[PDB]
Structures are given as C-alpha cells and as structure tokens.
C-alpha cells in the first residue's frame, strides 16, 4: 500500500478547485460530516459524486432549456455523455457545497465574451439527482455549457455560508440512492483530519475536505488490497526527513490523528509528505500531534 | 524502482496546460512541427521542467499583489501558495499559463472578508510590460481588484483585432530579447516515422482555429513521474494503449526520457482515431530505434 509521495501543499482539494493549504480538526471533535466529493475507499471504490481527477472537482455541464421563469440546465456528465438519474447523487464531479447560492462560470462547448456566470439557488427547482437545476444569469448562455464553481454566497440575506454542509440532491432521492455515508469520528481521542483550502465564500472561511484529490486518484489507480483495520501513516518533513506525526488512514477512506489539547495538525508545517508505514489494528493508539 | 504510467483511462486525465479534462489524442498536421510548451513538462525520472507544477489544480493559475502605476495596474507575482517568486531558474512562477501570443482573461479573488461579487477578471496583454520572468505583469480590469489576488486562466482571445489565437505557441517571458528565461527545451519529433502525441482539451479560445488546447503529457502522468522518481533503464519506454474491459492492445506508443509520447500514425489518420477510454500501460524498455507499429 502507498499514499501519494507529494507534499501537502502540492495536493488539491477534493471539494473545490483549489490547493490544500492546511490541515485541521473540527472544533467539536464529535462532529459528523457527509461530504459527497473526496470520497473513496482505500481499495479504490469511488463514493458519492467523487470523480478521479482534480479537474473534475466541483464542475457542472448541461444543456440550457426554458423554465417557467427563465432558464435551467438539463445536466450531463462532464464529458458530455448523458447523465441518467440512477445510483449516484448527481453527475460525477457535481459540487457538494450545501445550503448556499452557487456562482458557476461556464462556456459554450467563439466570439466576444465566451463566459456566462450561472447563479444557482438550492431551492425547490434544485434537483441534481433527477438531472436538472435552474439559474439566473446576467449573460445569455445557450446550448451545451461546461463550467466550474467560481464562488459561493448566502442563500438568503443575513444568512452565512457553512461549507461543511452538503446539498439536498432532490425529492427523487431514496434509500436506493448512492450517497456516500457519514464519516463518524471513531472514538478514543481520535479526530478526523480535514484538509482546508482558501476559496471565495461571501460572508464566510475555508473549504474542508476529507481526502486530498490525489489520494482519491491514487486509490482508484492502485486498487490495493486492504490488509489491516487501518493504515498507519507518518507525515514526514521532505527536507530534513524527520517524522513529524502519526495518522491513521481508514479503509472507508478518511484520516484521523490524536490532536494535542489546544492544538492539532493545524500546528504542523504544510509541506510534509504522508508515507505509509504499516498496517495496524482499529484501536492502535496514536502519538498525539501538534 | 520500476517505471509505470498511471492506471487511469484517457478520459479521466487532466490537461497540463489548461484546467480541463483530456477528450482526445491527435498528431500535428505538420508532423515536423516543433513545440516548446512550458507546462506539462517532466522527465521520466521525475524532474519537473519549465513552469510545470505537480497538481492539476495549479495548472494555468496566477497569484500576485496588485500595484498601481501612474498609467495603470499590475501584479507583482508570487508563487501560487503566496510565497515570494524569485527569478532564478524558471520562466515564471510554477503553474503560470503558457498559452503564447494572445490576451489572457484570468478570474481572480482576494485571498479577505468577502462581500458583494468577489471576482475580478484580469485582462492581460502579452506586450512590453508582460515580464513574468522578472516577476510582474500588467492588467486592466472592469472590476476593482486589490491586494493578494489568486485565480485561474478563464479564456483567451487575440492580441489585436483580426488576429487569431494559436495555442501551440508559448509566451515570451522576458522583458528584453536577451533575458535568460530558462525555458524547458524544444520537443522535436524524434525520427523513425514518429509523431508527437498531443492530448487535447476543449477550452474557450476566442478566434482560434478550434476551441482546443494541446499538451504533451497528461497532468497525472507528470505527478506520477514526480512521485515515483524511477530510474530510466532504456532509451525509450514502450507503452501499450489498452481497452480496459477486453485488455486488448489498441496500439504501441513510445515514452521518451525527456518526457513526451510518440506514435507512428497511419497516413491520413493517427491516435485521433482510437477510442478515448483506453489506458496506457508500460510494456518494456526499448532502443531509441525501436520501430513502432502504425496506429489509427
């Protein structure tokens, strides 16, 4: 088993198109999240809407159609192939930043200004599982539009954006839908490690994810057999080669540490490299970090 | 120890010159065309060249501090993590776009307690003040960007009215003609009927012959080589492009130590005629001289 031989600051966020700039633990270490991007088992099984490449993360593609009040998108996959409402929550790569307005910069798959900003609300017509969303735009997009989440803002005036939330994918979502399951803190002083990125959030501050995107592609590419209850990783300074801290990587595809009280992995340098050390039991005690 | 290439199908690989996903391969219409892309460049041993960064989310991005002159605005460039850019051995900060001889339109945000519209579109001309190697560029904008701006190339357009964008060109990174900008070297088609394989992505190019951008290595190939640091054990690495369901070899390709891929295209055709869901797989080390079976 290996993990990417790449320093943390050269790893991409799996929920927004941005580069990780620190690790942290949640203020409430019992907080449960249910991110739909950045989800992949250690054996290489993608979960939720998680795609393989960093350039598929938080992107939308679809055909413009007429809706009672304006225009909307009939969604496709990002490669333009049809999106059929099935097991997944939405097309692969579809953004998972919940409970906020999205602003998505798209182009028609040119003369003049080719870009349209699609302003998308997560209200009643927001139905990504069924394959459609609505938008308003100050431009006039038509046809096959492909684009990327550019920024997010509050759903209503006075509200704040919480990028730790996920969307509601629609009324057509049932128990048969393949939503990635919650990530539960596994107990005994361990805390989930969140990888944070700067991103434009109006009235907000950083966007968390639970796996750097290159970890996802690594697991998919490798299809490695899981040979223990957790993978013990060391976070190594690539210049001095010193071991800076112990982490556990769990088969369901998330990472934990034991944060020192009043600290944690947010106090480690952000240029270290994770390195697989050994397979360990589920209750293997970690040395506290940070 | 042993060289491999990514077990990832073509359609799941990212472009190394724009933030986009590869949707086909092709060869150049002039098969003797020499290119000198500065992104997507990495040796098989894992040595990054030019401005090439490691992650797909560093590709064609710009960061810097806004400054004002008497006549206008510019960015004093930094690396993408905000640390200082020092002119030393590289054309520009890592990840800096390399689409030459055109206007750029770069969408940035202030890295700030945001209110209102946080985005600025920076319109950048590749004229005299375009001096990324020395660390600054000028821009105009219909918005009001200040401070530490970070963003991504959004689209490109002609330098002058009536001109076209040619995304096969690279910028002139220097302010004077004899400024050493430390470019990654040119890539020549290497003989034996071989043609360089270009990986194409859809991208908004206003007034280009097509709205596509070529690159010479998928971004995940670059990061793979950086991670592996594998020794080169022959003059070229023979690859097969394989159907991931039937495991059939759809064609032979050569991967060269300097970090590019070739094939021998059938006349009037080439890898543009292959399926786009195949996976490249290392087969063996072969002599520079190894004659490939034609494809497509």
UniProtKB/TrEMBL annotation, chain A:
Entry superkingdom: Viruses
Protein name stated in the entry: Major capsid protein
Portion of the full-length sequence here: 232 to 526 of 539
GO cellular component, one term: virion component
Domain Calicivirus coat protein C-terminal: 75-290
Chief localisation class: host cell
Cellular compartment(s): Host cytoplasm; Virion
Protein source organism: Norovirus Hu/GI.7/TCH-060/USA/2003
Alphabetically ordered keywords of this record: Host cytoplasm, Virion
């Amino acid at each position: 088993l290996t993990v990417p031989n790449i320093p943390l600051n050269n790893l991409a966020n799996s929920r927004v198109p941005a580069m990780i700039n620190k690790m942290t633990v949640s203020t409430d270490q019992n907080q449960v999240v249910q991110f739909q991007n950045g989800r992949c088992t250690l054996e290489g099984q993608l979960l939720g809407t998680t795609p393989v490449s960093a350039s598929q993360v938080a992107r939308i593609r679809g055909k413009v159609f007429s809706t009672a009040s304006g225009k909307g998108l009939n969604l496709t996959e990002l490669d333009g192939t049809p999106y059929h409402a099935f097991e997944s929550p939405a097309p692969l790569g579809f953004p998972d930043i919940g409970a906020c307005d999205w602003h998505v910069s798209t182009f028609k798959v040119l003369s003049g200004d080719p870009m349209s900003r699609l302003d998308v609300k997560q209200n009643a017509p927001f139905a990504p599982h069924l394959g459609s969303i609505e938008f308003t735009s100050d431009q006039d997009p038509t046809g096959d539009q492909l684009g990327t989440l550019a920024w997010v803002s509050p759903s209503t005036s006075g509200a704040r954006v919480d990028p730790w939330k996920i969307p509601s994918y629609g009324s057509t979502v049932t128990e048969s839908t393949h939503l990635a399951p919650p990530i539960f803190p596994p107990g005994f002083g361990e805390a989930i490690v969140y990888f944070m990125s700067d991103f434009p959030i109006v009235s907000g501050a950083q966007v968390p994810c639970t796996l750097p995107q290159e970890f996802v592609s690594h697991f998919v590419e490798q299809q490695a057999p899981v040979r223990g209850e957790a993978a013990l990783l060391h976070y190594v300074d690539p210049d001095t080669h010193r071991n800076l801290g112990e982490f556990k990587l769990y088969p369901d595809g998330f990472i934990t540490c034991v944060p020192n009280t009043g600290g944690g992995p947010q106090n480690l340098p952000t240029n270290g490299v994770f390195v697989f050390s050994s397979w360990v039991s589920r209750y293997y005690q970690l040395k506290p970090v940070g």
